[PDB]
């Protein structure tokens, strides 16, 4: 029973909501396979490339920050599992840093393996 | 006889308002450490106070509006009957 | 034309700020030595002024000695204080 | 009279700009804030404007084991 | 920002075009107008050395201070003499409004403030340091200078 | 463009503007001045004097028509026999009904003539209206309550009110064509009294006129002689 | 996202101020909370006694995001008292599918729906009410002595500020100054608390406590008497937010001054929240081997709290007559089984603490939304007792007497049926879900020794029983005091209606009469399914137990 | 208490206190205090009646809390001393 143009107002707000509801779930879905909550043999494939061909190319493992050494643990220690606390607050990790909870081993075993099947390659050309 | 309650208000956001000021003073003069991070928090407590104070504009709470030939009838002639 | 009697009283004023100026440099100058003083002066420049003071007794007093005189091991001011810590 | 935002927005925006000029222009200096955060960073690092590295603000203790220096001992005094 | 700064040091002193306060002629204004004798003289010398202090502090925050445009004696006249200078300026120009302008009714200086300087300010708040991130001018904040 | 007048557009007076229908207002007037004189006697000067002035302006009205008005004219009068519940004050009152979100309309007859008097909702920003402009009675009455309060609390209303949406069973009022901006100049140019809003100005203060000169029935014998020596001044004897 | 929605509604909020908006507001928040309860049932995958959050400031377990979905949902319930109009028509030319999705109805609702009621007209009312939630949820996931502070007034200040969002009555501003007054005294006793934990440790941090309590739990120099004492003085300050006796005087004020619609939400969400916050808190200071620690344990004020409320609640109510301050003394009578549960710190009893708690909140929810209902159903009702007309705020709070229920099995005698269960539940009769609460806390109760306070639980139960039958007997034992509106049925009263299609034409047209007047089905179906779990739970008590059973296993897992 | 503050170092916060307290929530304070309808004669209680109750709560109260509070605080409070 509300005036002409209430409904109109109510609906943007609404779609707003939804749209920021929506985006939040979409991200804890993803998000969620990186923690090892939810099945990621497909995500664990993937990163396990990457990461490798990062290594071989002389690249950081997560990047080049512009922030201190010390403000990269706050970041760490600010967004570390922040999206289990989604439907409360909202946070994003948008810092480069080397504080991932995982021991970075496997990544290096990896591409020393691979760097020498791609030389044995080499040499019998 | 009754007050008026536009004083009540002007104390009331200032004093709202004073305590936000002084919470960004300790940024000003910590800008070069807090960097990009800090900022980023500085900016997202500024954006919150300000819907606060959008609240206070949209409202008008200290009484914007205070003080302030359309006509309902028109006749029209049918002629004799 | 221009009225300098309206100025008059700007002149003063201009006059005194420079009469709080100067006095204020002088005394301060008389103060430290003859010398131009600190400020912005830090922990770290009052803890040299401090090491200043246990090597030629003046707040202010300077030494390009490459050795300490006898006694400079023994006179380090340990502060003491009854209530505020 | 006043134009509505949501049907027409340019519309809107000009009449905001002439009839509540401090309201309309603290908005666009306040959105100046992120936009300049999107676009100045990366117009300098194509022009080479490299950002300085932060100074010390600790001593700077050096990383790696012991140099194992060999010089000004006991014996070198007086 | 020193125009909206010079603007509130006037409101800061209850000076004109904001001087509701002294107003004898509105009808309700006027409070500073039933005080005799001493107290007269304490709120009167308040409010001028209020007034030479915000000129003051004014020049201190945008004007460079005591900087210009060998003997401590002359450095320190010079530099006394220039924060003299800048301040007397202000003083005059605080007195050229006086003159200049009618009275503002309380209703439009408190909307003045709320609707036009603060969100103005805030959105200044803003912008202001998202400069000086943007082109790494963060300024250091240990004793320096 | 300014081939209309626009009703609440101001004149040049302050606070008289523009008229929202000004010509059938000037009919409705003077016919209503025609019938309220018809109780005064024949030998009155003070009704011959209202009806020459009255009758010599109201041909002048009537010599100045909107454009299309007899197309108008066939559609109305047919609208208010097939609606005449619609339109009558015995049943919907004199200001059309209690519906102020909704449009009202009423016929009324003076001298033998009919007019229709029409209301509209004031436009409003609708940023700023509650339920369309529908009165705000309070809430309703709650809880243990007697039989004689909720009677005060218009509960019959419930029975008799109708939804703003709800017309089945009723009809659009079509206004009247208006005079356009050029017709009512040349018109107040014939009637020679000013604007057109001052002349239903003057209008209506003789229609109010007409009730205070019954009431004090004015063209009777002198009520109080002047007794000898009332208005004798200081004048020399010629 | 409760976050974004509060800042997101504000800002839509800010810039209108029609009143008509006020529904609109109320239902986009229940919208908003749906998708809380989406973010958080996606965070449950993962066994963990806790989560340190957002640099320790904060932490989640799966405790806390059960209880966070918990606090959601009695929200989206209590948000319908202000989502829907109280009343609607039904016909039964309007009750197919194709009708209530493809055809419209037309009638003069104004008056019939109360269109403008104040429960309506308050645009900020969703607003507030959300800023409450958010104070419960962070205080739940709080990790940090001034995080616990920052909370707790959050949450409190916007219970002050809904005691009085009704400006225009002078009870509900009076109730909301009480509430203010005496709230900020224990907040006092918080922050007290608060501090001296951090004079006497160094930390503010819950971890650092409990390594400290930890350690110092042995079997000199620094002993740790300030632990124990602090958190006293800390937990009497959460004593008076839950009304527990002996301080408990102000809700049985604040209760009846404040609007119903009100009291529903400010009664229910904040016990909620501090128990839950109080359990891990027990948990983790409790100290195993019997030294000089345990002898001055800070949850003895529990246990006495616990005994002074089942005496108080049970006694006191015996003498109320207004509707409400019986209900707080109902619910100071449960916040000692309650706070016994907390206080016997088994495996057993904090499977009881937490079963005790989620069925006690869906039980005095329905009886809110029962008391409620049956004001709005009074409409078409009128009566001629004295005592009725002479009652303050009667459109905020309809119902205030217990005697203005009498014969309500006469005007609706279904709803007085869920009125029944829900009472009978709350003395504790089987097969309810009530009796099922009270069972378990007095086995884990007496399998942990508490034999004294498990006798005086019985028997307040028999002395709280009475208020309870006194309730019971006004509703079914006389005949009602209220008849039904004559000109609302005087066979020539009749409003009417309009069935109208898609596209705005005329289909039928019903002329229609009070008894076309119903109650919403909002209202009607949350009654009738609480009403259902109540009397039901013997046939689906697996799930909801095995819940507690496992949140249990994971705090208590060695 | 600010002036305190500012004396043994706490510089910031002292100066908050007088910003924020006196410059702010005391004026608030006053002003609805000096706009409302005050008959002190309402206002006033018989306070000797209320001072055995207050003898009694100090004494109790002060002997709990102070046996709380850490050296820090309670060091140099009420011939052999310590610098
Ligand atoms: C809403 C309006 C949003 C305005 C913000 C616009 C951002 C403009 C910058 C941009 O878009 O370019 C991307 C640019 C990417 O840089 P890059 O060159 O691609 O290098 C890769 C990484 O940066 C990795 O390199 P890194 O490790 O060196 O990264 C450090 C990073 C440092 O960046 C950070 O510190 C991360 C901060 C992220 C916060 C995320 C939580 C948000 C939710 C909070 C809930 C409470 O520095 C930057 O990259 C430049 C960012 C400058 C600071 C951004 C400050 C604005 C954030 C707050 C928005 C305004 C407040 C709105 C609140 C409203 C409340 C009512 O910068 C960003 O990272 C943007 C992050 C912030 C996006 C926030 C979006 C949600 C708000
Ligand atoms: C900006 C435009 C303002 C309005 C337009 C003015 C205009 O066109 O009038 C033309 C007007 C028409 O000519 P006239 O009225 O027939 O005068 C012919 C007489 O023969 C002229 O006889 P005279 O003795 O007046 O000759 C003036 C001569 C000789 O005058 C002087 O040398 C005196 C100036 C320096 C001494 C001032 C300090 C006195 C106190 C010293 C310390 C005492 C305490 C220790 O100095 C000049 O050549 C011009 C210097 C003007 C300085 C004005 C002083 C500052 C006024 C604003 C003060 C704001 C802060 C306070 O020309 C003048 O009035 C003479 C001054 C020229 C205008 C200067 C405007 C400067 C404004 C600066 C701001
Ligand atoms: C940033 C500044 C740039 C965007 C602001 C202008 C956008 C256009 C809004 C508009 O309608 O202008 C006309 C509007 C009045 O025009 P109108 O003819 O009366 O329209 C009828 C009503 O507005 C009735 O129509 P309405 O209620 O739909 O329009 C109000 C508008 C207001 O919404 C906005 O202005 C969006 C603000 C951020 C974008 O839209 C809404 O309320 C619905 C969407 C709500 C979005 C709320 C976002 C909250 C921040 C969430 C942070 C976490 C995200 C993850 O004036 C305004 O500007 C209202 C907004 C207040 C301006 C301050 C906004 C920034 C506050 C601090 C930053 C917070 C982040
Ligand atoms: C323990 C838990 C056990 C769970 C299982 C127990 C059985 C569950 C029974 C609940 C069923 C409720 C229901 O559907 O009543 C229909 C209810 C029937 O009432 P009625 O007496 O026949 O006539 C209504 C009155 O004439 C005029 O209507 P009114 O003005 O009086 O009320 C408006 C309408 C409210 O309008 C709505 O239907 C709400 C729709 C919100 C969105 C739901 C869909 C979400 C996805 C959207 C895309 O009524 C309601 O539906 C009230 C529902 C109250 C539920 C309260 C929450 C639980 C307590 O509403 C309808 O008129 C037909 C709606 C048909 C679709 C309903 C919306 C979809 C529901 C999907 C559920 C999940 C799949
Ligand atoms: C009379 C009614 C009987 C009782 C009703 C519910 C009682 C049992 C509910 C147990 C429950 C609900 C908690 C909400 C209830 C809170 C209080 C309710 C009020 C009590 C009346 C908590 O289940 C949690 O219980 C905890 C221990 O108790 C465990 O610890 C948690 O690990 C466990 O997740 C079930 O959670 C589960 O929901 C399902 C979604 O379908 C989730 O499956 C997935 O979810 C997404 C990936 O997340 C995926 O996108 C989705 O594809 C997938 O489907 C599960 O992942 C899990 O989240
Ligand atoms: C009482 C029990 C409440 C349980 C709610 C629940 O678990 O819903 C799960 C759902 C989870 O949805 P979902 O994202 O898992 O949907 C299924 C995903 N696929 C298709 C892959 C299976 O949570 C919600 O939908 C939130 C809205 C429901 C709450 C609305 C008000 C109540
Ligand atoms: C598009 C952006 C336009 C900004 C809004 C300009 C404007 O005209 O706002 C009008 C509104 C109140 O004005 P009014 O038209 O009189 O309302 C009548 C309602 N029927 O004003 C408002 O309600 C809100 C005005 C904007 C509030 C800005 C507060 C300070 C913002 C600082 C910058 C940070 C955010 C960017
Ligand atoms: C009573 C006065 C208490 C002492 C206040 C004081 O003297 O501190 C000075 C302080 C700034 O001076 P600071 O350099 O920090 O310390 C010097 C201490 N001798 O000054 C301040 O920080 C605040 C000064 C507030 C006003 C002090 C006078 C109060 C009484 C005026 C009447």
Redesign the pocket.
């Known amino acids: 029973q509300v005036g002409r143009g209430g409904f109109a107002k109510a609906m943007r707000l609404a779609g707003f909501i939804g749209l920021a509801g929506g985006f939040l779930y979409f991200y804890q879905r993803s998000i969620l396979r990186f923690y090892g909550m939810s099945e990621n043999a497909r995500e664990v494939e993937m990163d396990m490339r990457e990461m490798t061909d990062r290594v071989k190319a002389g690249l950081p493992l997560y990047g080049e920050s512009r922030l201190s050494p010390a403000m990269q643990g706050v970041a760490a220690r600010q967004s570390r599992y922040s999206a289990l606390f989604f439907g409360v607050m909202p946070w994003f990790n948008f810092v480069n840093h080397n504080q991932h909870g995982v021991d970075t081993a496997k990544y290096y075993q990896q591409a020393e393996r691979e760097l020498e099947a791609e030389r044995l390659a080499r040499e019998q050309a | 006889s009754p007050f008026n309650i536009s004083f009540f208000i002007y104390g009331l956001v200032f004093l709202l308002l004073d305590l936000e000021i002084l919470l960004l003073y300790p940024f000003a003069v910590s800008e070069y450490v807090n960097s990009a991070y800090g900022l980023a928090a500085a900016l997202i407590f500024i954006g919150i106070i300000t819907i606060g104070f959008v609240y206070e504009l949209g409202h008008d709470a200290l009484k914007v509006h205070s003080r302030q030939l359309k006509s309902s009838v028109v006749i029209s002639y049918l002629g004799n009957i | 034309?221009?009225p300098?009697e309206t100025?008059?009283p700007?002149?003063?004023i201009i006059?005194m700020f420079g009469v709080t100026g100067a006095g204020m440099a002088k005394v301060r100058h008389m103060f430290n030595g003859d010398k131009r003083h600190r400020w912005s002066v830090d922990q770290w420049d009052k803890q040299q002024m401090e090491r200043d003071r246990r090597l030629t007794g003046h707040l202010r007093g300077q030494t390009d000695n490459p050795i300490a005189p006898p006694g400079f091991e023994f006179n380090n001011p340990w502060k003491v204080x009854x209530x505020x810590x | 009279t006043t134009p509505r935002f949501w049907s027409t927005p340019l519309k809107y925006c000009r009449w905001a700009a002439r009839e509540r000029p401090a309201l309309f222009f603290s908005v666009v200096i306040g959105a100046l804030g992120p936009v300049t955060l999107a676009t100045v960073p990366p117009l300098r690092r194509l022009i080479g404007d490299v950002d300085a590295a932060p100074i010390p603000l600790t001593y700077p203790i050096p990383p790696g084991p012991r140099k194992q220096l060999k010089g000004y001992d006991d014996d070198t005094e007086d | 920002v020193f125009i909206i700064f010079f603007i509130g040091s006037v409101a800061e002193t209850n000076r004109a075009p904001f001087d509701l306060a002294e107003a004898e002629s509105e009808l309700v204004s006027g409070f500073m107008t039933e005080h005799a004798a001493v107290i007269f003289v304490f709120f009167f010398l308040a409010e001028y050395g209020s007034i030479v202090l915000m000129c003051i502090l004014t020049s201190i925050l945008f004007l460079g201070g005591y900087l210009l445009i060998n003997a401590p004696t002359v450095e320190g006249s010079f530099y006394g003499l220039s924060l003299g200078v800048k301040t007397?300026?202000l003083i005059?120009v605080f007195i050229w409004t006086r003159a200049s302008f009618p009275r503002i009714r309380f209703d439009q200086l408190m909307s003045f403030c709320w609707t036009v300087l603060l969100p103005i300010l805030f959105a200044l708040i803003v912008l202001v340091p998202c400069i000086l991130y943007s082109f790494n001018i963060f300024p250091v904040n240990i004793s320096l200078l | 463009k300014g081939k209309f007048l626009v009703p609440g557009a101001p004149t040049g007076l302050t606070g008289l503007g523009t008229h929202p229908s000004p010509r059938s207002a000037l009919l409705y007037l003077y016919h209503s001045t025609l019938e309220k004189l018809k109780q005064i006697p024949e030998h009155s000067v003070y009704r011959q004097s209202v009806e020459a002035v009255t009758r010599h302006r109201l041909a002048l009205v009537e010599s100045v028509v909107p454009e299309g008005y007899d197309a108008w004219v066939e559609r109305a009068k047919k609208l208010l026999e097939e609606h005449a519940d619609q339109f009558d004050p015995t049943k919907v009152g004199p200001e059309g009904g209690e519906e102020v979100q909704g449009a009202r309309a009423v016929k009324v007859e003076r001298d033998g003539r009919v007019f229709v008097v029409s209301r509209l909702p004031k436009e409003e920003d609708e940023r700023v209206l509650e339920w369309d402009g529908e009165v705000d009675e309070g809430p309703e009455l709650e809880g243990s309550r007697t039989l004689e309060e909720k009677i005060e609390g218009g509960l019959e209303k419930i029975f008799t009110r109708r939804d703003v949406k709800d017309t089945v069973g009723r009809v659009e009022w079509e206004p009247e064509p208006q005079l356009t901006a050029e017709q009512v100049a040349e018109l107040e140019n014939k009637i020679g009294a000013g604007l057109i809003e001052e002349v239903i100005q003057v209008a209506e203060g003789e229609l109010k006129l007409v009730d205070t000169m019954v009431k004090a029935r004015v063209w009777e014998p002198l009520e109080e002689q002047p007794r000898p020596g009332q208005w004798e001044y200081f004048e020399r004897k010629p | 996202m409760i976050m974004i929605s509060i800042l997101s509604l504000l800002l839509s909020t800010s810039v209108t101020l029609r009143r008509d908006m006020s529904i609109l507001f109320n239902r986009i928040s229940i919208i908003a909370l749906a998708y809380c309860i989406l973010h958080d049932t996606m965070s449950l995958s993962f066994i963990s006694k806790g989560i340190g959050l957002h640099g320790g400031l904060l932490h989640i377990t799966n405790l806390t995001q059960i209880f966070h979905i918990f606090i959601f949902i009695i929200s989206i319930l209590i948000l319908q008292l202000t989502s829907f109009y109280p009343r609607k028509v039904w016909i039964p030319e309007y009750s197919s599918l194709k009708d209530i999705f493809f055809n419209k109805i037309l009638y003069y609702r104004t008056k019939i729906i109360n269109k403008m009621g104040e429960h309506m007209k308050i645009i900020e009312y969703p607003l507030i009410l959300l800023f409450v939630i958010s104070g419960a949820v962070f205080l739940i996931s709080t990790n940090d002595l001034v995080s616990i502070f920052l909370s707790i007034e959050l949450q409190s200040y916007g219970l002050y500020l809904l005691s009085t969002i009704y400006r225009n009555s002078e009870l509900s501003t009076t109730g909301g100054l009480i509430y203010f007054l005496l709230g900020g005294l224990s907040s006092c006793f918080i922050l007290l608390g608060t501090s001296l934990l951090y004079v006497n440790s160094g930390t503010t941090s819950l971890d650092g406590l409990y390594i400290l309590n930890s350690i110092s739990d042995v079997n000199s120099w620094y002993k740790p008497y300030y632990l124990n004492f602090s958190l006293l003085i800390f937990s009497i300050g959460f004593l008076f937010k839950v009304s527990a006796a002996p301080f408990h005087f102000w809700s049985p004020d604040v209760y009846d001054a404040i609007p119903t619609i009100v009291t529903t939400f400010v009664a229910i969400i904040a016990k909620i929240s501090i128990f839950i916050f109080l359990l891990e808190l027990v948990y983790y200071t409790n100290s195993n081997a019997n030294s000089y620690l345990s002898e001055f344990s800070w949850t003895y004020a529990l246990l006495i709290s616990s005994l002074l409320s089942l005496i108080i609640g049970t006694v006191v109510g015996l003498t109320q007559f207004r509707i409400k301050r019986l209900l707080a003394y109902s619910t100071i009578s449960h916040v000692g089984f309650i706070l016994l549960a907390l206080s016997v710190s088994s495996i057993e009893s904090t499977q009881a603490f937490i079963f005790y708690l989620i069925q006690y909140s869906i039980s005095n929810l329905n009886a809110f939304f029962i008391l409620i209902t049956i004001g709005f159903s009074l409409y078409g009702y009128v009566t001629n007792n004295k005592e009725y007309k002479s009652l303050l705020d009667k459109n905020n709070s309809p119902i205030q007497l217990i005697s203005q229920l009498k014969g309500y099995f006469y005007i609706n005698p279904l709803l007085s049926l869920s009125l029944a269960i829900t009472i009978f539940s709350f003395v504790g009769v089987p097969p309810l879900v009530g009796f099922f609460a009270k069972q378990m806390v007095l086995s884990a109760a007496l399998d942990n020794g508490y034999i004294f306070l498990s006798l005086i639980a019985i028997i307040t139960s028999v002395i709280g029983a009475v208020y309870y039958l006194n309730v019971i007997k006004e509703i079914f034992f006389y005949s009602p005091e209220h008849e039904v509106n004559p000109v609302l049925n005087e066979s020539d009263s009749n409003f009417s209606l309009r069935i109208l299609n898609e596209k705005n034409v005329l289909i039928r047209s019903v002329l229609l009469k009070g008894r076309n007047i119903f109650i919403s089905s909002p209202f009607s179906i949350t009654i009738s399914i609480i009403t259902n779990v109540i009397l039901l739970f013997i046939f689906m008590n697996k799930e909801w137990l095995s819940m507690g059973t496992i949140l249990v296993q994971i705090l208590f897992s060695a | 208490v600010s002036f305190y503050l500012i004396l043994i170092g706490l510089n910031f916060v002292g100066l908050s206190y007088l910003i924020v307290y006196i410059g702010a929530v005391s004026i608030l304070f006053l002003f609805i205090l000096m706009l409302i309808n005050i008959r002190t004669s309402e206002l006033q209680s018989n306070t000797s009646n209320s001072i055995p109750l207050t003898i009694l709560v100090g004494i109790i109260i002060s002997s709990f809390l102070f046996k709380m509070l850490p050296y820090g605080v309670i060091i140099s409070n009420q011939k052999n001393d310590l610098f």
């Open positions: 034309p221009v300098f100025l008059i700007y002149g003063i006059a | 007397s300026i005059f």
